[PDB]
Design a protein around this ligand. Structure first.
Ligand code: DGD
Ligand code: CLA
Ligand code: CLA
Ligand code: SQD
Ligand code: SQD
Ligand code: LHG
Ligand code: LHG
Ligand code: BCR
Ligand code: BCR
Ligand code: BCR
Ligand code: LMT
Ligand code: LMT
Ligand code: LMT
Ligand code: OEX
Ligand code: CL
Ligand code: CL
Ligand code: FE2
Lengths: 341, 39, 39, 37, 334, 31, 38, 32, 30, 63, 50, 51, 51, 50, 78, 35, 51, 31
């Protein structure tokens, strides 16, 4: 017995927590990312990077804590603990926001390890690896949003902070500065996510309401056993119902479930392509025909032009606080505002 | 408690749930006192 | 040299449901991207 | 305007009367199971 | 035998290609009316004075909009919650100016989708099904009623209802955030949990079923031809899928009962969308999202910002610029 | 409106090229 | 020979000595100890 | 102040009162 | 003239919807 | 299968299909080279990142 | 294109390493996917028989 | 330097057959493994050129 | 060059069954991908060094 | 038959036609390079490099 | 069904388990409590206490602007 | 009968739960920090 | 007013959901198919095809 | 040159519509 094959035996035992070869990448990296996030949201400030309190130690709550992005002065420095910024000082590393690339990098390598775990367990069990192919969507989202968006921007500062209200800030920032709702790549993402939620709800309700009477109890859940051969619900009845209700219906179970896979994964990939565009400020910010008309004609108003005005107001009122390294002094008279508010 | 060498699992569960409710209530109390209470 | 028949030739199919799904996808992609094409 | 109002009131009332009288006309028995009630 | 009984049998027939039913006798006229008026208004309605300040907003395609910017603009703020049919207008042009098409489309659409939910129950009853597909459909219905009816009622004007367009929806959402802080509302958070988890679990379910498909085709043809419509037997190995998923996380995190799995797949996004419908319906009465602004102070008393304070700066910037010409007084009371 | 001069040709080709591809594939199916 | 170069080289050495090498020894040791009986 | 002390003592008594009933009926053999 | 293009693409989607409902491949039990 | 002159020339380069070295072969030398490649990639990344600062130049358009 | 080619790699890598099950799983696959039966996941010779 | 190293590596990959373990692990009889690793190297280089 | 490669593609499409592509040991089409990799790597190294 | 997204599999086990499709792709890329350069040359303004 | 490990419902319903944990879990609780209440967490992580957000010589936000010499920058920020 | 006590599952439970209870006690003490 | 209106609107909605759940279950149970479709007498299996 | 703004779309459609019709008919032939 070779030592590699003995180690392969030990790593792929049937235990409570499967390890595998992928676990050597997954578990230390996922533990580092999760412990870094919990450590930062419990103890670590954003006072020197953002001028903000973002830990439970400062009095923030679960909504208002974050592992915030590092200072804009560092650019896209990877901000290693031993790196030229922190210089080995753990306290300085915490204060300059090094927990953000710590969490983001270990998280990215843990996500790699998780899709590798999906591949490894799919190979061992003997099934096709479509769970890993489906998980390509979340990794596309993580790579485009937390990595390539700040890389395209000036620093890691403009990456989303690992927090609830920090993510809400990133979301509103992308509305006001990028017009990300107007981007068709995000619209395909929204369509994919709402379609995935629709398909989940409709598929579950259809199965639960086309169940076969396979038991004597009103509790229908005990009328199923996993080792049975026949279908637990009537695809014919479900097909007839949705054909007469909606006009069309699924007639193929395998196509139904591939579509349930396909819709949100494709939405995530499309929104990722849009975030890649936004990394370089390649926005769908404006419809130039409507601005040219609105500049020439003061009677022309659409909901698009109203959204443009909303974005301008948000940018001017948020940027001095959201980007304190820039020292944006906007006196009150230059702030755009409507009548009386 | 009603067994040999054993504690009922529902007693363990009610104790753990009471402790979890207590620490959640303490965390909600701290929203209105001390830091982060806006006063 | 001789021009021999290739035995790796295989027919392509697209069923009517696939046609309808593709036509709807292409129509909604046109609906989505036409405003940006016009700008 | 009065003619359109009368026409819409008649159309709406006819559809609502259809709905009501149909659900009053032994709709529980219009099912493939046990139609006794 | 009777003419009425023959009509009742036709109406309730399961042999209709599209099921009508008694709910369909209300659904079809209302939905056809709303569809026809929406299409005509989206193409060719004149501009609508939504804020009631004689500042008409071009909503239709013939007046300079594209598909993204086009909308059926909500009715005038001067109307408020007043019932504004065609016969209450002095002319059709006045009706168009004041946003009557929005009221017509929205009222017939809301009746139609409530009747769609009733019809879903009706056909499940005629087909000998269990009846709770309509309960799952009640979550999108509640969300639609929240944004088209309940939010206007609580705000006191149908001008506050979501516009029937893409950029109009974005405008509704941005003004909603600036006024109610919906992102900080936990019901919206539950909705985001519902849609993110519903898409997650849709991807999971689909990927596990596609992963565990029984080999019934060659490598040339599509694997979907391994399923025959109306086959008795299972098209995929649930035990293999459970073995994979209980090794991917751990054994007791994986469903083995397909009925519990599908009840969970139904229940998660439906409950999430119910909660977010109630969140929008409760911010109709101005019960807003969490206000943590200036919640952290130092020992002197100076405000230490958090991410909620930056979010509030964004909300203020959205608020001071919204309906720029409609406000005359210092507070946006509704 | 002052739109892109190529917007009409791009929209028609973006719709019509894969429409043609799908129609070609559907009509030949069964051969 | 800079401080950043020395810190990078020490990072290579200490990522081996803290993470890679002791995990390699621990995995080899526990796989040799708890063997699968065929 | 003693008001949180009394509040938490009353709260503790009432939170224990229910599981005391369930626990007595489990221990002594009640018709649970 | 962009309005013609928008009307055409919306009409193509609605025609696809009609032909997919009215002229679907019928689901057959076999 | 039709013979050509170019095919007959190139034939010994496509005659060893599936030939393997039994066992692990040169996998350890491979892994040593992959480790050295990873370290080299780390070096050039940290130089481009300005996380590794070397004397004699600066990462800037002026060198 | 680099982002989309990440999906291509995953797709083709998965199609490579899972070529045997591309048409579907085996029509059995029953006992090997049960929990606790075999000491090693997917290995037949590692049956505990206990 | 990379061309010299590529010449040396090509000479090794021309004279030395793969190990049986690496042949079976990476499925070297399948051309799709070449497609997979080439797509991997290609997106690596595309990320590099975009950066 | 594009025209020349189009014509060469036409030739290879039409004369697909070259004797070089089949294994002399078995009777079927086989590419020795590690050897092709070694040749292409050597060509890549030579071209990289010359450039 | 083959689904649309798999049509190019026909050259999976055909090295001659695989080489042919590679040539066709290489021809299309080189012809794009030539035609793109010709279009750029036809519309280039060389009057002021500054 | 059982991969080899003791079932959790057996474990947590044992006298010996709760004898060990009645001690370990509360004393981990008090370890976190003494991490915060002795003030060691502020010094460990560099989080300001409620009177070092601003000093008597700095009343603005101490936004780092140095790229490499951040230790001296945090020191003069205090 | 005669189960192991120390497993990979044991370490998987503690790696998470020991700092979880430590952090919970920390945040509980944070609840009593005055301004 | 805000608390009362919000609470009672949420309660009214969830009680409409209860009506739908119980009205449908009452009809299904009085009709005899609240536990699922009988396999032998599945009603759709005796209907003509829709097209 | 000051050409008709519809000349490009008319030329492409005039070529491409019957081209598509012919390709549809040729590819389905033999079914
Ligand atoms: C698949 C899934 C698997 C997932 C894996 C996840 C793990 C990944 C591990 C790698 C993580 C990548 C770290 C990248 C660090 C970086 O980029 O760091 C950035 C550096 C460059 O540094 C930046 O350079 C900029 C330009 O500077 C130049 O110009 C300045 C102004 O004139 C000055 O003159 C300056 O001195 C001069 O150097 C600015 O200075 C920035 O502040 C500075 O941070 O590039 C570099 O290290 C290297 C650049 C080449 C390689 C790029 C690879 C990443 C691709 C990025 C795409 C970029 C943009 C597209 C966005 C979309
Ligand atoms: C050099 C890279 C490369 C190569 C040689 C291949 C080759 C192949 N792929 Mg893969 N793939 C790749 C990258 C690549 N792929 C990438 C980047 C992705 C992510 C998008 C995928 C995702 C993928 C999937 C999901 C599938 C394949 C499949 C296939 C096989 C059949 C292809 C086919 O007939 O489709 C035919 C395509 C059409 C009929 C129309 C597609 C037109 C596209 C959408 C737009 C046109 C693009 C334009 C003309 C050129 C620009 C592209 C260029 C900039 C890259 C074939 C072996 C299939 C398979 O595995 O077979 C068993 C399969 O299902 N691929
Ligand atoms: C009609 C119901 C109703 C209304 C309008 C109010 C209103 C009010 N209460 Mg009261 N209360 C109620 C019921 C109600 N309560 C009940 C049933 C109890 C017994 C538990 C209490 C006990 C109580 C106390 C002790 C106090 C109040 C207080 C208050 C005031 C402030 C509320 C606040 O900030 O809390 C916070 C708001 C929340 C925590 C929101 C909770 C959201 C719930 C959980 C939604 C439920 C979801 C759904 C129904 C679940 C099923 C759905 C399912 C299908 C998925 C306010 C006027 C306070 C006061 O000011 O006294 C003078 C005070 O201290 N209430
Ligand atoms: C995060 C935690 C890290 C996880 C670490 C996981 C453990 C390490 C996994 C290693 C996987 C690769 C090794 C596979 C076995 C093999 O190839 O060799 C097989 C041989 C012989 O094994 C024996 O050899 C016998 C004969 S033969 O070799 O096959 O010819 C054979 O019959 C027998 O089966 C076989 O056992 O084993 C050896 O000991 C070789 C050790 C070196 C293997 C590569 C490591 C190189 C790492 C580079 C780092 C150093 C460079 C640093 C630069 C600064
Ligand atoms: C402590 C180490 C626990 C973590 C670990 O890696 O387990 C590795 C194994 C423990 O699990 C061992 O491993 C096996 C189960 S499992 O692999 O841990 O899942 C099991 O067969 C064995 O009895 C068990 O002792 O190491 C031991 O056998 C050391 C004995 C433990 C007693 C001293 C503590
Ligand atoms: C008691 C809780 C009831 C609340 C209603 C929510 C559950 C129903 C939602 C499903 C909607 C989709 C409809 C089609 C789906 C469908 O058709 O379901 C079918 C499914 C099958 O049930 P049976 O017919 O076997 O039994 C139900 C009755 O017929 C008799 O028991 O019904 C149920 O499982 C009901 C169980 C609910 C009881 C527990 C659920 C608790 C979940 C809510 C908890 C709170 C969530 C928020 C917390 C943050
Ligand atoms: C009450 C009367 C009718 C109500 C009106 C409903 C109209 C729309 C009905 C859907 C039309 C079907 C077209 C899909 C094409 C079609 O007919 O496919 C039919 C298809 C059946 O698939 P099978 O199971 O038969 O597939 C087996 C194999 O053929 C796989 O290829 O059903 C689905 O795929 C559902 C998944 C997509 C569902 C798409 C619907 C999207 C909703 C509508 C989007 C509108 C966009 C345009 C707006 C301008
Ligand atoms: C950073 C870092 C690191 C790491 C660390 C670690 C890895 C750790 C950790 C850690 C951890 C790992 C921690 C934890 C935690 C936790 C917590 C804080 C918790 C919580 C919770 C809660 C509060 C919950 C609650 C609840 C809910 C809500 C649901 C149900 C019910 C209950 C009540 C349960 C080191 C040193 C390497 C180095 C430096 C850097
Ligand atoms: C025959 C021949 C010849 C001729 C040649 C030629 C004349 C050529 C050419 C060529 C060419 C002239 C070419 C080309 C090309 C192109 C391409 C290949 C393209 C494309 C496309 C694409 C792919 C794109 C796509 C897209 C779109 C559309 C949108 C946006 C996005 C993207 C980019 C994706 C000669 C006599 C000399 C010689 C003999 C033979
Ligand atoms: C869910 C869950 C759980 C948990 C639970 C818990 C944690 C709890 C609870 C609960 C409790 C812990 C309770 C209680 C109770 C009590 C009661 C219910 C009472 C009463 C009474 C009354 C009514 C009062 C009266 C009074 C007055 C009025 C004044 C005078 C004096 C007195 C105090 C007598 C378990 C694990 C089991 C199972 C699974 C899940
Ligand atoms: C799988 C990947 C895992 C990699 C990550 C795992 C964590 C690795 C941590 C690496 C830590 C680097 O730690 C680094 O150690 C060196 C030497 O000890 C310290 O260096 C210090 O000590 C040395 C030796 O006394 C002095 O000569 C030197 O002047 C001084 O700076 C660095 O200041 C510190 O930054
Ligand atoms: C939940 C996780 C717990 C977080 C860990 C708790 C401890 C955090 C660090 C506090 C310890 C002391 O805090 C700080 O430590 C760093 C090491 O990083 C010391 O730093 C010292 O060694 C490092 C490493 O070579 C070099 O930077 C330098 O030689 C010197 O500054 C500082 O002098 C001390 O001020
Ligand atoms: C089967 C269901 C029922 C269908 C049958 C009923 C048909 C409709 C009957 C009501 C007809 C219209 O009812 C009538 O509407 C007109 C609208 O001009 C109202 O008229 C009112 O408004 C108009 C202008 O709008 C004023 O000029 C008028 O002075 C005032 O009275 C009447 O007060 C009401 O009596
Ligand atoms: O309309 Mn639509 O948005 Ca409800 O809040 Mn007041 O009014 Mn108007 O300003 Mn802000
Ligand atoms: Cl506005
Ligand atoms: Cl006002
Ligand atoms: Fe399913």
């Amino acid at each position: 017995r070779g030592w590699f094959d003995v180690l392969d035996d030990w790593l792929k035992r049937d235990r409570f927590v499967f390890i595998g070869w992928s676990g050597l990448l997954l578990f230390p990296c996922a533990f580092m990312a999760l412990g870094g996030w919990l450590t930062g949201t419990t103890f670590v400030t954003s006072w020197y990077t953002h001028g903000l309190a973002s830990s439970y130690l400062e009095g923030a709550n679960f909504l208002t804590v974050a592992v915030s992005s590092p200072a804009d002065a560092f650019g896209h420095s990877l901000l290693f603990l031993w790196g030229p910024e922190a210089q080995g000082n753990l306290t300085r590393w915490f204060q300059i926001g090094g927990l953000w690339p710590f969490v983001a990098l270990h998280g990215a390598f843990g996500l790699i390890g998780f899709m590798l775990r999906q591949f490894e367990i799919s190979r061992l069990v003997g099934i096709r690896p479509y769970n890993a192919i489906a998980f390509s969507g979340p990794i596309a989202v993580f790579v485009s949003v937390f990595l390539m968006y700040p890389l395209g921007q000036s620093s890691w500062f403009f990456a989303p902070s690992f927090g609830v209200a920090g993510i809400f800030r990133f979301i509103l920032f992308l509305q006001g500065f990028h017009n990300w709702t107007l981007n068709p790549f995000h619209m395909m993402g929204v369509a994919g996510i709402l379609g995935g939620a629709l398909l989940c709800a409709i598929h579950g309700a259809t199965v639960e309401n086309t169940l076969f009477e396979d038991g004597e109890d009103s509790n229908t859940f005990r009328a199923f056993e996993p080792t049975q051969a026949e279908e637990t619900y009537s695809m014919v009845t479900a097909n007839r119902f949705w054909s007469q209700i909606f006009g069309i219906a699924f007639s193929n179970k395998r196509w139904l479930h591939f579509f349930m896979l396909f819709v949100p994964v494709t939405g995530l990939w499309m929104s990722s392509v849009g975030i890649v565009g936004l990394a370089l400020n390649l926005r769908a910010y404006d419809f130039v025909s409507q601005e040219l008309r609105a500049a020439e004609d003061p009677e022309f108003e659409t909901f698009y032009t109203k959204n443009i005005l909303l974005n301008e107001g948000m940018r001017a009122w948020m940027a001095p606080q959201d980007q304190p390294h820039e020292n944006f002094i906007f006196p009150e008279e230059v702030l755009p505002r409507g009548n009386a508010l | 408690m009603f067994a040999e060498g054993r504690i009922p699992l529902w007693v363990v569960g009610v104790v753990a749930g009471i402790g979890a409710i207590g620490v959640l209530g303490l965390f909600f109390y701290g929203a209105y006192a001390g830091l982060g209470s806006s006063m | 040299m001789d021009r021999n028949s290739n035995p790796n030739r295989q027919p392509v199919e697209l069923n009517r449901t696939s046609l309808y799904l593709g036509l709807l996808l292409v129509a909604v992609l046109g609906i989505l991207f036409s405003s940006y094409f016009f700008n | 305007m009065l003619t359109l109002k009368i026409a819409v009131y008649i159309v709406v009332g006819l559809f609502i009367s259809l709905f009501i009288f149909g659900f009053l006309s032994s709709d529980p028995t219009r099912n493939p199971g046990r139609k006794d009630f | 035998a009777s003419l009425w009984e023959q009509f009742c049998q036709w109406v309730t027939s399961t042999n209709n290609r599209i099921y009508v039913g008694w709910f369909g006798t209300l659904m079809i006229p209302t939905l056809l009316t709303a569809t026809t008026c929406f299409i005509i208004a989206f193409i060719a309605a004149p501009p609508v004075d939504i804020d009631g300040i004689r500042e008409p907003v071009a909503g239709s395609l013939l007046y300079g909009n594209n598909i993204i910017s086009g909308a059926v603009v909500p009715s005038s703020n001067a109307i408020g919650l007043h019932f504004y049919p065609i016969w209450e207008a002095a002319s059709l042009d006045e009706w168009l100016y004041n946003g009557g098409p929005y009221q017509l489309v929205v009222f017939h659409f809301l009746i139609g989708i409530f009747c769609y939910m009733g019809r879903q129950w009706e056909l499940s009853y005629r087909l000998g099904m269990r009846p709770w597909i309509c309960v799952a459909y009640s979550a999108p219905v509640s969300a639609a009623t929240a944004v088209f009816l309940i939010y206007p009622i609580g705000q006191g004007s149908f001008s506050e209802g979501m516009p029937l367009g893409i950029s109009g929806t974005f405008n509704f959402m941005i003004v909603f955030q600036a006024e109610h802080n919906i992102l900080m509302h936990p019901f919206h958070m539950l909705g985001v949990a519902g849609v993110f988890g519903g898409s997650l679990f849709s991807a999971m379910h689909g990927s596990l079923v596609t992963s565990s498909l029984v080999r019934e085709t060659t490598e040339v043809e599509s694997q979907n031809y391994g399923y025959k419509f109306g086959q008795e037997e299972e098209t995929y190995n649930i035990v293999a899928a459970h073995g994979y998923f209980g090794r991917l996380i751990f054994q007791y995190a994986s469903f083995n009962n397909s009925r519990s799995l599908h009840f969970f797949l139904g229940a998660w996004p439906v409950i999430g969308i119910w909660f977010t419908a109630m969140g929008v319906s409760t911010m109709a009465f101005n019960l807003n999202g969490f206000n943590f602004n200036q919640s952290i102070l130092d020992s002197q008393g100076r405000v230490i910002g958090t991410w909620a304070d930056v979010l509030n700066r964004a909300n203020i910037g959205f608020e001071v610029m919204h309906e720029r010409n409609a406000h005359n007084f210092p507070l946006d009371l509704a | 409106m002052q739109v892109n001069n190529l917007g009409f040709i791009a929209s028609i080709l973006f719709v019509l090229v894969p429409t043609v591809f799908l129609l070609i594939l559907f009509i030949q199916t069964g051969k | 020979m800079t401080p950043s170069l020395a810190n990078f080289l020490w990072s290579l050495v200490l990522g081996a000595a803290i993470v890679l090498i002791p995990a390699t020894v621990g995995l080899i040791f526990i796989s040799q100890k708890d063997k699968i009986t065929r | 102040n003693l008001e949180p002390i009394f509040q938490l003592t009353f709260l503790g008594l009432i939170v224990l009162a229910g599981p005391a009933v369930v626990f007595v009926l489990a221990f002594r053999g009640g018709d649970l | 003239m962009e309005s013609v293009a928008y009307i055409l693409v919306l009409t193509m989607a609605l025609a696809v919807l009609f032909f997919a409902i009215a002229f679907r491949e019928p689901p057959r039990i076999e | 299968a039709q013979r050509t002159r170019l095919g007959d020339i190139l034939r010994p380069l496509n005659s060893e299909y599936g030939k393997v070295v039994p066992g692990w072969g040169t996998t350890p030398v491979m892994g040593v080279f992959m480790a050295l490649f990873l370290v080299f990639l780390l070096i050039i990344l940290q130089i481009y990142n300005s996380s590794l600062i070397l004397e004699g130049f600066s990462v800037d358009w002026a060198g | 294109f680099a982002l989309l080619f990440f999906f291509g790699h995953i797709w083709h890598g998965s199609r490579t390493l899972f070529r045997d099950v591309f048409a579907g799983v085996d029509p059995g696959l029953e006992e090997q996917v049960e929990f606790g039966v075999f000491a090693k996941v997917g290995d037949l010779s590692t049956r505990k028989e206990a | 330097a990379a061309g010299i190293v590529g010449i040396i590596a090509g000479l090794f990959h021309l004279t030395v057959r793969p190990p049986e373990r690496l042949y079976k692990a990476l499925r070297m009889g399948n051309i799709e493994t070449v497609l997979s690793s080439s797509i991997a190297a290609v997106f690596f280089a595309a990320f590099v050129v975009a950066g | 060059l594009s025209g020349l490669l189009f014509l060469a593609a036409v030739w290879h499409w039409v004369f697909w069954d070259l004797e070089l592509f089949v294994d002399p040991r078995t009777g079927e089409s086989a590419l020795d991908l590690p050897k092709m990799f070694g040749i292409h790597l050597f060509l890549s190294g030579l071209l990289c060094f010359g450039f | 038959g083959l689904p649309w997204y798999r049509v190019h599999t026909v050259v999976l086990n055909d090295p001659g036609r695989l080489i042919s499709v590679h040539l066709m792709h290489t021809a299309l890329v080189a012809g794009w390079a030539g035609s793109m350069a010709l279009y750029e040359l036809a519309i280039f303004d060389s009057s002021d490099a500054v | 069904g059982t991969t080899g490990e003791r079932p959790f419902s057996d474990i947590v319903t044992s006298i010996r388990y709760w004898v060990i944990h009645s001690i370990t879990i509360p004393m981990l609780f008090i370890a976190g409590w003494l991490f915060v209440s002795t003030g060691l967490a502020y010094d460990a992580f560099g989080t300001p206490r409620p009177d070092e957000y601003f000093t008597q010589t700095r009343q603005e936000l101490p936004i780092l602007q140095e790229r490499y010499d951040i230790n001296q920058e945090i020191q003069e920020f205090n | 009968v005669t189960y192991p006590i120390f497993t990979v599952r044991w370490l998987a439970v503690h790696t998470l739960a020991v700092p979880s209870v430590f952090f919970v006690g920390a945040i509980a003490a944070m609840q009593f920090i005055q301004r | 007013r805000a608390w009362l209106a919000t609470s009672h609107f949420v309660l009214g909605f969830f009680f409409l959901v209860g009506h739908l759940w119980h009205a449908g279950r009452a009809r299904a149970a009085a009709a005899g198919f609240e536990k699922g479709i009988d396999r032998e007498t599945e009603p759709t299996l005796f209907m003509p095809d829709l097209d």
